[PDB]
Design a protein around this ligand. Structure first.
Ligand SMILES: [Ca+2]
Ligand SMILES: [Ca+2]
Ligand SMILES: [Ca+2]
Ligand SMILES: [Ca+2]
Ligand code: NA
Ligand code: NA
Ligand SMILES: [Zn+2]
Ligand SMILES: [Zn+2]
Ligand SMILES: [Zn+2]
Ligand SMILES: [Zn+2]
Lengths: 108, 108
């Protein structure tokens, strides 16, 4: 049976593929594909990015390290890593200790 | 609403926490916690690891880079990165092109 740790790893690759096969090379993200994925799959984690196209342009040029105007699976995971670490930090920030009660914000 | 890219990032941190808070430091994985997580959450991705304790010992000592006998969230993600990249490779291997039909193996 697939554990929830296994589904999360699969869903990440499944979601990258859902946007990489749309145009151009089927295993890389064009600008249109990456903006489409970001606006549709990272709308809460990147609430300021979806509406501010000026930010997606900065992110695309930082992730595209080999400067071929598309994001390989390796280049796109660099963002997924930064999100996981940032979500882990915020999750500890939204859950302070010593209050004597739970918090249910998660990360944003 | 939480996209499936957002749930996967949350479930990864939620699963690491489910095993890190059991004993010792609540944000790190002891040996018992990491073996417990691996055997319960990576049973298919690491089918040879769950039954072969000799492998979990190698993995624990490679992930524990600062040699304090526990895995921080940063040290444990190094494994999660290798799994994602290995699952992405195997997913292309299990889905050859040109057969004229789909494949449903995913990755193992
Ligand atoms: Ca593409
Ligand atoms: Ca590139
Ligand atoms: Ca612990
Ligand atoms: Ca350590
Ligand atoms: Na690739
Ligand atoms: Na930490
Ligand atoms: Zn791929
Ligand atoms: Zn409180
Ligand atoms: Zn934590
Ligand atoms: Zn076939």
């Amino acid at each position: 049976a697939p554990s929830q740790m296994e589904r999360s790893i699969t869903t990440i690759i499944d979601t990258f593929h859902q946007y990489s096969r749309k145009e151009g090379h089927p295993d890389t993200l064009s600008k249109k594909e990456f903006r489409q994925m970001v606006e549709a799959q990272l709308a809460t984690f990147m609430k300021k990015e979806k509406r501010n196209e000026a930010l997606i342009n900065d992110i695309m040029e930082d992730l595209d390290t080999n400067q071929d105007n598309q994001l390989s699976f390796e280049e796109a995971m660099m963002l997924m890593a930064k999100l996981i670490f940032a979500c882990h930090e915020k999750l500890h920030e939204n859950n302070p200790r010593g209050h004597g009660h739970s918090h249910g914000k998660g990360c944003g």
